[PDB]
Each structure stands twice: as C-alpha cells, then as structure tokens.
C-alpha cells in the first residue's frame with residue numbers, strides 16, 4: 001500500500017494542479033482516487049510520481065528520464081492526461097470538481 | 113498464465129479474443145474492469161475476453177509494445193485486428209468490437 005503521507009501529498013498536489021491547469025476531476029472519483037494512490041505508490045517505490053497508467057520497460061530508468069513523472073510532458077504540453085486524473089471541461093468524463101477529499105479516496109479504494 | 117500460454121490461447125481460439133492489458137493502480141483500468149465484465153457477458157458467444165496484468169507479465173506487454181493503460185487489442189486468427197487505449201463506455205466498447213469484426 002502507499003503510505004498515507006504520500007497519498008495526502010499526492011491528493012493535495014492533484015487539487016492544486018487541477019486548479020492551476022483549469023482541469024477537472026472525473027465524474028467517477030474512484031478513477032481519481034486510484035490514480036492518486038498509484039502516483040503515491042510510484043513515489044514511494046522510485047522517488048517520483050511516475051505515471052501509473054502506463055507500461056514501462058524499466059520504471060526506474062524512466063523516472064530518471066523524467067518524461068512521465070506527474071505532471072507528465074503530454075499534460076504540461078497539451079493537457080493530455082491518460083490517467084483521466086486531469087480532464088478538460090469538454091471531456092465526456094469530466095465533472096466540475098477540483099476537490100478530492102481524503103474520505104472520497106478511502107471509500108473508493110477500500111478493497112485495494 | 114504466461115507468455116507462452118497466452119500465445120497458445122491466441123493461436124487456438126475459435127473466436128476473436130479481446131485482451132485487456134491492465135495495471136492495478138491505474139484508475140481508468142480499474143474503471144473498465146466491471147464494464148468489460150458486463151460486455152463479456154453480452155458478447156459471450158462472439159468473443160473470448162482475456163485480461164493481462166502488464167506489471168506481472170511484462171514480457172507480454174513488451175511484445176505488444178503496450179504504452180498507455182488500459183490497452184485493448186482484438187485478435188482474429190491469432191492476429192491483432194484492432195487496438196485502442198483508455199476508458200470507454202459499455203456502448204462504445206460493444207460498438208468498437210462489433211465494428212472491427214465486420
């Protein structure tokens with residue numbers, strides 16, 4: 001499991017970055033929550049929040065390259081987020097929330 | 113499940129095979145598991161569905177050059193005939209499968 005400290009850090013980061021990029025969380029905040037825990041797990045394992053919605057030949061090496069450390073280059077370049085963490089408001093899966101609470105994460109990832 | 117057992121499944125199946133290449137801590141991937149399970153039931157007599165944990169079987173993920181997760185590949189006669197990435201609704205998923213078939 002990711003540590004609670006890492007999860008809280010990544011949760012607050014996600015709220016801040018959504019506000020700074022003008023993006024919104026998914027209507028299904030279970031998607032948001034799983035991604036935040038995956039980012040936190042990678043941060044604990046490798047030392048940076050490598051994107052969890054991607055296959056890598058070598059995660060450690062890719063952390064060193066930096067392209068996919070959240071916020072990844074496609075998100076910084078064109079607000080493309082394969083994780084559906086940060087959605088543009090025209091996206092069919094976007095809600096209007098830029099808030100993800102600790103309770104939302106706990107309730108939707110409890111079985112994990 | 114293994115690199116070899118997966119390859120043998122693809123070569124022997126009498127139906128098209130839809131493969132979901134997933135990871136546990138990917139939110140879109142987890143979102144698609146129940147949707148895919150509903151679609152698998154709706155299409156039970158037309159396709160076989162297989163799910164591959166790309167973190168446990170990276171050899172398979174490397175063979176198919178999997179990038180974003182989830183990736184879905186639809187195989188016909190052992191050969192990929194369509195491929196897509198990310199979340200989609202049940203209706204979109206059924207429509208995409210039925211497309212690539214015809």
Ligand code: SF4
Nearest residue numbers: 051070072081082083
């Ligand atoms: S796709 Fe990029 S911005 Fe979105 S969660 Fe993965 S690393 Fe972060």
